[PDB]
Ligand binder design. Structure first.
Ligand SMILES: *[C@@H]1O[C@H](CO)[C@@H](O)[C@H](O)[C@H]1NC(C)=O
Ligand SMILES: *[C@@H]1O[C@H](CO)[C@@H](O)[C@H](O)[C@H]1NC(C)=O
Ligand SMILES: *[C@@H]1O[C@H](CO)[C@@H](O)[C@H](O)[C@H]1NC(C)=O
Ligand SMILES: *[C@@H]1O[C@H](CO)[C@@H](O)[C@H](O)[C@H]1NC(C)=O
Ligand SMILES: *[C@@H]1O[C@H](CO)[C@@H](O)[C@H](O)[C@H]1NC(C)=O
Length: 577
């Protein structure tokens, strides 16, 4: 009986983003006892609730959410005694929440999420003993959780996240026999999680993250079966993960990231067969990862980075065919990379950098049809980078730098359809560049620096998307290709520390956006083409330690660092000619 359906020659036009108190005011004028539901949500309304609203004495349902209602909460609403659900969420109500909610003794649902309330949580609420859902999150509430809130049985949902609450969590809250959902993180709570919370047998969702809590993780919480979501991240928990937590048979999501947990991932975790998401990022965890974690049938997300895990990755990880994102960077992992990681073609993000992984890149990875971002720099991977990556049609980011790869660079990389980043630096190839590397349709950053490259730099035909090129610190001999002007997007070029002889390619002056150029430590000869001096993008031009000849250009080279030169010949920039 809302939206102006039942009248209740009078308008029932609910739109035209009008402010309010009298756009309705009228809508309560209709003395009506035939109005049981009032849904004025999302009408861009603004103003106050008028006192006259008390005459809708038959109201059961009132939704005023998603407007711009302001001022203190309207006490008049409390005179709506048959109110059963009340939604005032997503508004701009401020000041302390006034006492008097008690008269709404039939209230089952109170949602006031996202408002401007301040002061203390109303202790008043604890006398609504039909109440089931309570949402007071997203405001500026202060102080402690009133221990009397634990007197709310039938209550199955409580949300108080995103306030400025603090103190210690009231152990009495554990008496909430029917609580299924508890979301009270993003506050300033301190102290430990109460042992008593282990009595919340019906609890399916447990937050309390981004707080200031501490202590060991309370073992007793292993009693909380039925629990599907356990978020305790961004706190200050210490000690080990309790082995009792392997009894959480319903657990789907686990997040202990950004704490100070130590010890090992308990081997019982291998029995949590419903785990979807396991995140233990940025802790002081150690020891090995239980083999059984690679056989969890539903595991899709695996975050273990910034710990100090040792040992092998579980042989059969990924064999469930459901692994999507894995990040175990910043550890001390060893052994080979399991071949089963991308079984099912669901793996799209594979981040393994900063470990001690050895052996050959498993060739199965080249048939990972969903792979999108691959970062495995800083390891001990050996052998030849396998051929097949260029056939992955969504591979966009590859970092295999600082490894121990040898012989040839796979020629498919050149024909990878969407590859945007490719490093490969620091790697001991002792082979030529693939001769059609610069035809890569998409490739913005290519950095095979200090990778023991040899031979001539192939002709820059194509060079469509390149804007950063790093090939410094190799043994590239021959001449810098004279067709470098095909690289119209180029910004930074480093060919320093090679064996490049011959002239500086004039066609560099043709580049619209070239900014940083380093050709230092080579065997270059000839002039710096004076047309360089009319560039209005070149910021760095290090060409020092060469055999160049003639005057340095003027124009926009007159304000360059003289250090950029160290060949026998110059102009006023240092020693006149
Ligand atoms: C209030 O309205 C919004 C959108 O109109 C809806 O999603 C929400 O469930 C409503 N609240 C209640 C308690 O029914
Ligand atoms: C993770 O690496 C960061 C720097 O990348 C470092 O500050 C931190 O100490 C590392 N943590 C562990 C547990 O190795
Ligand atoms: C991590 O463990 C390995 C040896 O198992 C070693 O790097 C060191 O003991 C630990 N590193 C840090 C930073 O604690
Ligand atoms: C390529 O990798 C090296 C070492 O792994 C790193 O120092 C460098 O910054 C990387 N280059 C780019 C462009 O990311
Ligand atoms: C340098 O280039 C010449 C081309 O004549 C080639 O014969 C020689 O092997 C190259 N140097 C190497 C590969 O070390």
């Amino acid at each position: 009986l809302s939206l102006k359906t039942s009248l209740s020659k009078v308008p029932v036009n609910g739109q035209n983003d009008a402010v309010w108190c009298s756009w309705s005011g009228v809508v309560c004028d209709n003395v009506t006892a035939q109005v049981i539901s009032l849904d004025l949500s999302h009408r861009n309304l603004s103003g106050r609730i008028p006192i006259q609203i008390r005459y809708l004495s038959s109201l059961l349902y009132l939704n005023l959410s998603g407007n711009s209602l302001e001022g203190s909460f309207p006490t008049s609403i409390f005179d709506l005694t048959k109110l059963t659900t009340l939604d005032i969420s997503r508004n701009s109500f401020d000041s302390s929440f006034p006492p008097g909610i008690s008269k709404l003794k039939f209230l089952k649902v109170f949602n006031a999420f996202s408002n401007n309330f301040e002061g203390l949580l109303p202790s008043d609420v604890s006398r609504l003993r039909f109440l089931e859902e309570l949402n007071f999150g997203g405001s500026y509430f202060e102080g402690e959780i009133p221990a009397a809130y634990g007197g709310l049985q039938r209550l199955k949902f409580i949300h108080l996240a995103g306030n400025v609450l603090g103190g210690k969590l009231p152990p009495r809250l554990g008496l909430l026999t029917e609580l299924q959902h508890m979301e009270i993180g993003y506050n300033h709570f301190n102290g430990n999680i109460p042992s008593e919370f282990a009595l919340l047998s019906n609890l399916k969702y447990f937050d309390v993250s981004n707080c200031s809590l501490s202590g060991s993780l309370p073992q007793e919480l292993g009693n909380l079966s039925n629990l599907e979501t356990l978020f305790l991240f961004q706190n200050g928990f210490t000690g080990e993960i309790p082995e009792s937590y392997s009894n959480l048979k319903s657990l789907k999501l686990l997040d202990f990231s950004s704490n100070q947990l130590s010890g090992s991932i308990p081997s019982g975790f291998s029995t949590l067969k419903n785990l979807t998401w396991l995140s233990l990022i940025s802790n002081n965890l150690s020891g090995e990862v239980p083999e059984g974690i690679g056989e969890l049938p539903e595991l899709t997300t695996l975050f273990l980075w910034n710990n100090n895990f040792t040992g092998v990755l579980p042989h059969k990880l990924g064999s469930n065919g459901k692994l999507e994102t894995m990040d175990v960077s910043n550890n001390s992992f060893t052994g080979t990379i399991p071949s089963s990681l991308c079984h099912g073609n669901k793996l799209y993000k594979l981040i393994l950098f900063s470990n001690m992984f050895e052996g050959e890149l498993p060739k199965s990875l080249t048939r990972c049809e969903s792979l999108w971002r691959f970062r495995s720099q800083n390891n001990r991977l050996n052998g030849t980078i396998p051929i097949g990556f260029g056939s992955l049609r969504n591979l966009t980011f590859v970092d295999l730098s600082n490894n121990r790869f040898t012989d040839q660079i796979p020629a498919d990389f050149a024909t990878a359809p969407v590859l945007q980043y490719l490093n490969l630096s620091t790697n001991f190839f002792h082979r030529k560049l693939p001769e059609n590397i610069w035809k890569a349709p998409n490739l913005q950053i290519f950095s095979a620096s200090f990778s023991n490259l040899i031979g001539e730099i192939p002709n820059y035909v194509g060079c469509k998307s390149f804007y950063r090129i790093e090939l410094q610190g190799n043994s590239l001999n021959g001449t810098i290709p004279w067709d470098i002007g095909h690289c119209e997007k180029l910004l930074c070029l480093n060919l320093s520390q090679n064996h490049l002889n011959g002239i500086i390619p004039w066609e560099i002056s043709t580049l619209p956006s070239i900014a940083d150029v380093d050709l230092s430590h080579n065997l270059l000869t000839g002039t710096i083409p004076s047309d360089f001096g009319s560039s209005k993008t070149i910021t760095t031009f290090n060409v020092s330690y060469n055999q160049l000849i003639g005057p340095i250009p003027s124009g926009s080279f007159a304000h360059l660092n003289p250090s950029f030169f160290s060949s026998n010949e110059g102009l006023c920039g240092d020693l006149v000619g």
